[PDB]
Amino acid sequence: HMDAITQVPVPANEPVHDYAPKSPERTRLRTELASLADHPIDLPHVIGGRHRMGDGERIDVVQPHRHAARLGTLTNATHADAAAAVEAAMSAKSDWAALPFDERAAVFLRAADLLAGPWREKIAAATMLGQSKSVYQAEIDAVCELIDFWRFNVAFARQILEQQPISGPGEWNRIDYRPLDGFVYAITPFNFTSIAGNLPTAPALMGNTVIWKPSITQTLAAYLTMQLLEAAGLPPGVINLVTGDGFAVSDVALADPRLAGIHFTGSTATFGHLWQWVGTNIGRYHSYPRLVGETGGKDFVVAHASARPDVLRTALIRGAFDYQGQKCSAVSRAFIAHSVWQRMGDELLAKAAELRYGDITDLSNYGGALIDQRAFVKNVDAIERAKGAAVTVAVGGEYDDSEGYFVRPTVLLSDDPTDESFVIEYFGPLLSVHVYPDERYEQILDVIDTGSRYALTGAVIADDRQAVLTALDRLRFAAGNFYVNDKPTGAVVGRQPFGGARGSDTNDKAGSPLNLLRWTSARSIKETFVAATDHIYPHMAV
Amino acid sequence: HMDAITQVPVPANEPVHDYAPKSPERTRLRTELASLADHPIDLPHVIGGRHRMGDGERIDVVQPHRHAARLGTLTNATHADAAAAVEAAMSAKSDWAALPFDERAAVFLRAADLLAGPWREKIAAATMLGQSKSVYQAEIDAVCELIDFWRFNVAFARQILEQQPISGPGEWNRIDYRPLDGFVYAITPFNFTSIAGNLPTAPALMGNTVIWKPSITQTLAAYLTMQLLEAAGLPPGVINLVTGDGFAVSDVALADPRLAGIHFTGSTATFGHLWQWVGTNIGRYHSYPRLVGETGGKDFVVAHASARPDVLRTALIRGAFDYQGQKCSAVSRAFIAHSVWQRMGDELLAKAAELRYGDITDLSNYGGALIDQRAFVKNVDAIERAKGAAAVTVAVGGEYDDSEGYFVRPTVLLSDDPTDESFVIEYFGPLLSVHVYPDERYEQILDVIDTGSRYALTGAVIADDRQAVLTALDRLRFAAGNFYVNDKPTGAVVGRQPFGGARGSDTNDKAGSPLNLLRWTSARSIKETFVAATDHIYPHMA
Amino acid sequence: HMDAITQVPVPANEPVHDYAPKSPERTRLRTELASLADHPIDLPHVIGGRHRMGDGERIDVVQPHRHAARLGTLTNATHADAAAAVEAAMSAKSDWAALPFDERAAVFLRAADLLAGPWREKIAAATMLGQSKSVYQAEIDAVCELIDFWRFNVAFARQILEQQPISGPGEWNRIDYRPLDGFVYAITPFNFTSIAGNLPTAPALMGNTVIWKPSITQTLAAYLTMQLLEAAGLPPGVINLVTGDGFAVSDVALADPRLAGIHFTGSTATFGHLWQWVGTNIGRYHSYPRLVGETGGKDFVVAHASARPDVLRTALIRGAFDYQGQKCSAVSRAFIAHSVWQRMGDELLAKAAELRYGDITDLSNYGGALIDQRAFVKNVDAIERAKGAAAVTVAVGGEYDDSEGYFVRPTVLLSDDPYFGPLLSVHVYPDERYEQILDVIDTGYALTGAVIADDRQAVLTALDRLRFAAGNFYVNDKPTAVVGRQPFGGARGSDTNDKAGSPLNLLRWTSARSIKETFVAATDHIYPHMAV
Numbered sequence A: 001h002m003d004a005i006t007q008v009p010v011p012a013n014e015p016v017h018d019y020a021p022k023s024p025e026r027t028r029l030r031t032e033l034a035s036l037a038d039h040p041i042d043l044p045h046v047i048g049g050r051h052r053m054g055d056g057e058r059i060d061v062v063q064p065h066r067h068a069a070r071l072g073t074l075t076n077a078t079h080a081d082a083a084a085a086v087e088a089a090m091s092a093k094s095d096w097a098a099l100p101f102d103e104r105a106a107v108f109l110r111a112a113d114l115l116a117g118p119w120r121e122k123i124a125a126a127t128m129l130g131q132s133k134s135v136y137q138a139e140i141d142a143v144c145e146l147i148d149f150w151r152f153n154v155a156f157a158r159q160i161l162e163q164q165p166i167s168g169p170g171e172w173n174r175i176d177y178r179p180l181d182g183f184v185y186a187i188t189p190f191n192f193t194s195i196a197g198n199l200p201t202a203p204a205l206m207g208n209t210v211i212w213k214p215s216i217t218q219t220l221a222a223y224l225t226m227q228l229l230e231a232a233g234l235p236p237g238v239i240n241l242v243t244g245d246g247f248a249v250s251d252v253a254l255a256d257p258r259l260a261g262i263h264f265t266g267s268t269a270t271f272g273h274l275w276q277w278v279g280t281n282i283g284r285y286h287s288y289p290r291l292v293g294e295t296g297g298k299d300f301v302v303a304h305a306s307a308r309p310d311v312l313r314t315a316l317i318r319g320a321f322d323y324q325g326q327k328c329s330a331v332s333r334a335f336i337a338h339s340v341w342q343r344m345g346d347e348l349l350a351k352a353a354e355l356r357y358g359d360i361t362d363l364s365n366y367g368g369a370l371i372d373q374r375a376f377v378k379n380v381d382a383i384e385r386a387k388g389a390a391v392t393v394a395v396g397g398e399y400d401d402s403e404g405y406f407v408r409p410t411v412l413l414s415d416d417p418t419d420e421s422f423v424i425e426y427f428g429p430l431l432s433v434h435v436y437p438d439e440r441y442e443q444i445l446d447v448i449d450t451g452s453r454y455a456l457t458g459a460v461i462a463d464d465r466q467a468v469l470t471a472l473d474r475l476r477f478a479a480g481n482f483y484v485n486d487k488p489t490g491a492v493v494g495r496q497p498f499g500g501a502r503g504s505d506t507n508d509k510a511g512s513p514l515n516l517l518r519w520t521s522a523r524s525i526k527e528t529f530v531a532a533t534d535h536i537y538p539h540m541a542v
Numbered sequence B: 001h002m003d004a005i006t007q008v009p010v011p012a013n014e015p016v017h018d019y020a021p022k023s024p025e026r027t028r029l030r031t032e033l034a035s036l037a038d039h040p041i042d043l044p045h046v047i048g049g050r051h052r053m054g055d056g057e058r059i060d061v062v063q064p065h066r067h068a069a070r071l072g073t074l075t076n077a078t079h080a081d082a083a084a085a086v087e088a089a090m091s092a093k094s095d096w097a098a099l100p101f102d103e104r105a106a107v108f109l110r111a112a113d114l115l116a117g118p119w120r121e122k123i124a125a126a127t128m129l130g131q132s133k134s135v136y137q138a139e140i141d142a143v144c145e146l147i148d149f150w151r152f153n154v155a156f157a158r159q160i161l162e163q164q165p166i167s168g169p170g171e172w173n174r175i176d177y178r179p180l181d182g183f184v185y186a187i188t189p190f191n192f193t194s195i196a197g198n199l200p201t202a203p204a205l206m207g208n209t210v211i212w213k214p215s216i217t218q219t220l221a222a223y224l225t226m227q228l229l230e231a232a233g234l235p236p237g238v239i240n241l242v243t244g245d246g247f248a249v250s251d252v253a254l255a256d257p258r259l260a261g262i263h264f265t266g267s268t269a270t271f272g273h274l275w276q277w278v279g280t281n282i283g284r285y286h287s288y289p290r291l292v293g294e295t296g297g298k299d300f301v302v303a304h305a306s307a308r309p310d311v312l313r314t315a316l317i318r319g320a321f322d323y324q325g326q327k328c329s330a331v332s333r334a335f336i337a338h339s340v341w342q343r344m345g346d347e348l349l350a351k352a353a354e355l356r357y358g359d360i361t362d363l364s365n366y367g368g369a370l371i372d373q374r375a376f377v378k379n380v381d382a383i384e385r386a387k388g389a390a391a392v393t394v395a396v397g398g399e400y401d402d403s404e405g406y407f408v409r410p411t412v413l414l415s416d417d418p419t420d421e422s423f424v425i426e427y428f429g430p431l432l433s434v435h436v437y438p439d440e441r442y443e444q445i446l447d448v449i450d451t452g453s454r455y456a457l458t459g460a461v462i463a464d465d466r467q468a469v470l471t472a473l474d475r476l477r478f479a480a481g482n483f484y485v486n487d488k489p490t491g492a493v494v495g496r497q498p499f500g501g502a503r504g505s506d507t508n509d510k511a512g513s514p515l516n517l518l519r520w521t522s523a524r525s526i527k528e529t530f531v532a533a534t535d536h537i538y539p540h541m542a
Numbered sequence C: 001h002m003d004a005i006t007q008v009p010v011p012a013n014e015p016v017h018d019y020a021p022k023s024p025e026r027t028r029l030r031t032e033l034a035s036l037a038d039h040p041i042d043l044p045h046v047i048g049g050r051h052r053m054g055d056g057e058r059i060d061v062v063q064p065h066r067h068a069a070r071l072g073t074l075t076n077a078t079h080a081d082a083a084a085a086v087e088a089a090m091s092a093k094s095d096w097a098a099l100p101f102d103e104r105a106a107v108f109l110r111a112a113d114l115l116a117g118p119w120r121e122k123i124a125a126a127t128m129l130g131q132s133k134s135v136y137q138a139e140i141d142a143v144c145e146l147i148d149f150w151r152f153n154v155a156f157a158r159q160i161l162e163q164q165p166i167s168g169p170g171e172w173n174r175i176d177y178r179p180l181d182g183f184v185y186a187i188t189p190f191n192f193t194s195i196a197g198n199l200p201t202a203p204a205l206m207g208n209t210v211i212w213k214p215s216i217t218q219t220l221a222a223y224l225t226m227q228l229l230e231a232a233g234l235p236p237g238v239i240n241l242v243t244g245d246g247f248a249v250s251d252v253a254l255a256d257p258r259l260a261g262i263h264f265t266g267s268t269a270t271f272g273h274l275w276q277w278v279g280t281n282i283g284r285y286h287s288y289p290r291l292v293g294e295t296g297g298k299d300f301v302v303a304h305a306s307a308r309p310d311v312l313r314t315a316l317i318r319g320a321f322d323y324q325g326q327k328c329s330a331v332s333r334a335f336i337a338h339s340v341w342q343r344m345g346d347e348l349l350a351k352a353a354e355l356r357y358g359d360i361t362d363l364s365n366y367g368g369a370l371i372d373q374r375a376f377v378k379n380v381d382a383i384e385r386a387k388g389a390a391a392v393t394v395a396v397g398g399e400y401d402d403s404e405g406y407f408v409r410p411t412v413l414l415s416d417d418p419y420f421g422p423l424l425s426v427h428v429y430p431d432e433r434y435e436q437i438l439d440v441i442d443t444g445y446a447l448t449g450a451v452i453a454d455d456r457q458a459v460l461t462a463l464d465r466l467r468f469a470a471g472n473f474y475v476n477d478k479p480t481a482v483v484g485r486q487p488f489g490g491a492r493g494s495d496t497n498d499k500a501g502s503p504l505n506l507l508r509w510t511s512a513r514s515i516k517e518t519f520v521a522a523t524d525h526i527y528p529h530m531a532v
């Protein structure tokens, strides 16, 4: 037993290492990079703690920047693999939920520290190699964001458990934050190792068990993440990894009456599909399935006449070309005041032309390649469509998939304000610029407001305080998270929570205590010390 | 302007008046009861501030305990009325949302004080008359719970606004809790004037506008609630009352692309139907519609051998027979240890037979009648079902008479085997089933309760023995939402028993906590960077 | 537009850079020192965002440690310039006060960060060159203290807004912290770039507009401060810089009915002048003008027999000779126990003689020159007065030479019996007369005082006996103040707890109102006591 009201360790954001030349983290990275690239492995399912290949189709995981070089080979999950995954989760449930919160929280605090230290460059390298991230992109994702999710989630949960009601006289009221009944189905995207690791672990923390199907092109980092958690003491069957395209996993998971929730990322259409499925089939499930996730998007930047040219240029290059434009959202559209374009337009184009995409084991590259052949084709189609469209290819537009899925940084010049519908059909290094007359700032904000339904983030570049405030007012609803004098980009944990595209309902996604509450079912407990012994009410008296 | 970080008044639960003989509030109540009953009124739509009867069929609102006596007449809303209400809500949106939080809050704080003072016995009487509540039931509902919702939600909202993120060095992060785009559709049940009043006002507080369709039999109190809110300063069009059965209202609201959310009560099947509809048609809406509500249920009480018999008796009588069993849930099943039944069985049956249901203007009555003809018929069916059933005996009560009011007597069913839950949910009325179990089979009975209950909102254990209490807390942890120790299991007091819900439900975002107000917001982060990067190159590239 | 209750960032004191050899801030500093010295500029007024030279007489701004070298040239404000600055302030007021606190706050937060990074060495260099500060004196003033002023004032302001009343039942009470009606007049001294920058920006933060009149010798750093603020996003006309001696500026500003307050730091001589001038015109002002400021003073150090000699010796050197004794207060009198003087007197004199005053672009120098010819003269007069006095011996230093800079050597005087400059008077007293020496100090004005003693009774005796003899008291350190750490003070009898360094200052730039809403007020006027 134990008699205490304990605290969890206070979290702070994990520092970002630079990997400068001659740094010790740089040397350790090269060691891990070589270790992973020279020794490809089976990428097995992990079900009830046991690691095995299944009988499904073998699919190679390759380096996107060098797709002749294989990192590993997984087996596409069969229905039977999926069924085993679900039985393993259900079977582990009782012992996992019976652990005190602190013991469950220690698993992820230990995992965070393992990732911060001895596992650091290995998870980063795995992410670099499988997902074609530069070391910086891997460091902010696979290391810092995942570590932050774990430590801040533990703190979030402890804060939740402490939210308690008022006790009136003669009584005692308490709230018990129960885990869910049944298993959680986590489906994770290629874009981030952090999301990949967090969607399955966040409900686990609250006492739930999980089947996890990661994206194929992220599976090397996913599998190592699974190993890391095991090394941290995660009991077998608490999270169950099944690899592949997810088709057979979804057949099984959505047919199981014990399905408690789905933690995922996807489009509005995907949400709608799952909504329609769960609603149509609600009578099949023991619990009402909880559908929790986020969408992707494409972002905008608007520069006022008072914009600092160099800050804008840099915000644009990073916002559009960090990770080859393959974050959950990237900057696709820039709205630049004429006088500002006169001052930094040529520089933007020149820097874009010089920007290096290549093998990310060459640390001098800015970035790598697109994630797979499918993503490559969509970028080529968008580029060709731009060439023929009455818009100019000011720089870039070159592509070559002979060795890696490489697409050059591309700037399009649109005479008229760029139509949003066109930029959402691909994810890649494609920036559209519209130059507008300085004096039409308010008109352009209205065009941005009127024509943006798919932005996660937006930014205004301006030193003028009125212009900043006007943008904050006028574009209040045109994007979720909004930025002043910086690139609009991914959130740091605990610093830019919430957001979402216009009209969305995703404030319960990862990044705040609201996400963890979805994986709980609160009940109130009331005890009355001296309750009534006569049912008569005062008003009934003669 | 204004330069301040303001606090809202600190909320405390509103005191409950007793209306004992010779009390001033009892005299005021009698004045109000006569005024409403002797002067039936039109019950019009309130659209954009204009009170109008429409062209739909006229429907009488009556006293359920004396259905020959009209209280008013409403008109069934047409599609045109519903369209006008939506347009009024969208017209009022801009000025309302632009009001500072404090001024929007003031409206509902003022309404709280109006209901606590000058409007108190009028709203109570309206609820008494229309919903057939005793004054005690009116008081805890129409007065105290509605007041507590307003004052506590204002405090909840202010607490939400204060939830802010970390600022790293060189930056400033802030969170903006935006209203939704579009209107909220509020659909409210007959059972509580408080719920009827809270579901449309809670979103309004956060800067939204609303169409409100109340239940026909609650429409006298709902219309007066609407008048109260106007007297407190609610601007026109912010809440728009449309009367009737809701069919045409739902046609229009669910077809309008500006539908932002629905705030309602209903069954799992209703939730499923709305999920199915919104998912199938997601492409029609500007925003992802938010479906926020709660369900009803039927509750249980288990008495251990160490239960205090007078306490158990009182909790069963009040739990099953308060408001004729017509709360959101009520006690339908009691599981009582043999030796405790020997001590209080005869007294339970005798008290139940003596319990007076009648005209609630006669304050000496315990309670009134069922809410309408349809509910009466369902009770009759349940009683005849029991009479013909081999398993069960009518031990007391079972009489019914709809000739003057919709009256059904307090009824106790004795069941040889544990009562099958599926029977007790087909009605809402004063029907208590009792199962007597051998003292020594306490844990077995707990397993039976657990295995056979899917629809309990609340549950209670009566027991002085601490092991027995703790065993119930553990073993029935998931068999009900809110759980009670040595008291009747019933409706929560605001801020004292939040959350709950039936097994597997997902309704922790319902009214009663800050989580509900967050659903009527769309939070965004704002990040200003003071000295952003001016070169895009990264340290690892050197 | 926002629905939120926001927090401002948490302020921490800015780290002081050491500028040691081979350090990168040293290289960056040398670049800025050359760039400012080799390319003197016009120093214009800044009125409604417009940078304009005026028609008043041209006045050069030079390096005090090399007064032949011009740093820039300003024009002395004319009545017309002053009137233009006032109109620009009043015209800018409406859009500035209408900005939300957070947006006004961002300007100074952004300025703070700009000063910490890209502007750091330039502003420090301008302060070194114009005011003759060593790089250390520049860094703790022009950089760290100004940065701290901005970040902590933002935190202080936000904590003021949060100070709210209690609501009884049936009501809602709130407090609105309004800005002032009218413009605030900031007049700032040569001593500190940080003070020069804080006096106009602090009222600005609370939503006021300002005319700012800096000291001629500080005007290079002040103008760059103005540019930095503009680069941070300060809207035009919110602060208006008028250069010169300020005679014309005061003529206009103190006659204008819209004068809301004066924010000043410098001599009590020139504050008497300006205190008085309001005293007469009082019926003319729309608002009761708020006079807020601080004056100078000179400090004592008393060393008990238990004083550590190395500590005392170091406290005296730095306290007396940091910035050539020209801080808002300097150590000018020391009272040293005989046994202690035997142990460190010779070393004090020796060190004082070796202390290098010179061109502060020579980073090996301890300090530079006095601020101007007027200051040079008053020290010479003081030195020559000491020579000619009986009870006074010039034990070391006393030399001076204004031929190239305004240089006065570190000087220690010895008096048998008990102006800004590097002059220290030492009185040696017998150990066993500690309490009598305390009485003497008490009876003999002083801003800060310090006791050097390891003995706790001795320490506590001084804290008790000199409680009212100084406004800031120090134990085992030089009395030479840091934002948020040693606030308040003032000379004996002064009323200046509302000066810079605490929330009380920002409150002087606000007029608070209460707002009360009653939800269900009385509908009858008769009282219960009136019934029959």
Ligand code: B12
Binding pocket: A187, A245, A246, A247, A248, A250, A251, A264, A265, A266, A269, A270, A273
């Ligand atoms: C809805 C859906 C789609 C949608 C997806 C988005 C939407 N809602 O508008 C659209 C409508 C895009 C779609 C397209 C197709 N899909 Co489909 N899709 C489904 C379904 C029913 C649900 C998937 C889902 O939402 N999962 C939940 C989310 C959270 O998980 P997810 O891993 O992120 O799911 C993504 C992928 O599954 C992907 N996807 C969907 N279908 C297909 C098909 C292929 C070949 C690939 C590579 C990817 C892919 O889209 C989802 C959203 O990103 C499944 C059934 C199933 N068993 O999976 C099929 C299913 C996967 N798709 C199938 C087929 C046949 C098709 C189509 C060829 C025909 C068609 N038009 O429906 C095309 C191929 C498109 C392509 N990408 O190459 C088959 C796959 C058969 C197989 N290869 O083994 C499935 C299994 C249904 C079936 N049994 O017939 N369909």
Ligand code: B12
Binding pocket: B187, B245, B246, B247, B248, B250, B251, B264, B265, B266, B269, B270, B273
């Ligand atoms: C889903 C639904 C039902 C369900 C409800 C529960 C469920 N999901 O399993 C069941 C399946 C119970 C149902 C039954 C019937 N309903 Co129906 N119902 C609907 C529907 C499509 C949506 C209602 C809803 O969920 N509203 C949202 C909730 C949150 O709001 P609510 O006010 O609380 O809704 C409640 C009432 O509408 C009530 N209800 C539903 N139908 C009917 C019909 C009548 C006559 C009454 C009095 C009440 C009622 O059930 C809801 C939940 O309690 C509507 C269409 C519409 N425009 O409203 C019809 C609709 C109201 N019902 C209709 C009809 C014809 C019927 C039935 C007579 C025949 C049938 N089986 O379809 C029966 C009558 C039942 C009765 N109580 O008398 C017609 C009404 C025509 C008219 N008189 O003007 C509608 C307009 C359209 C339709 N048939 O599709 N239906």
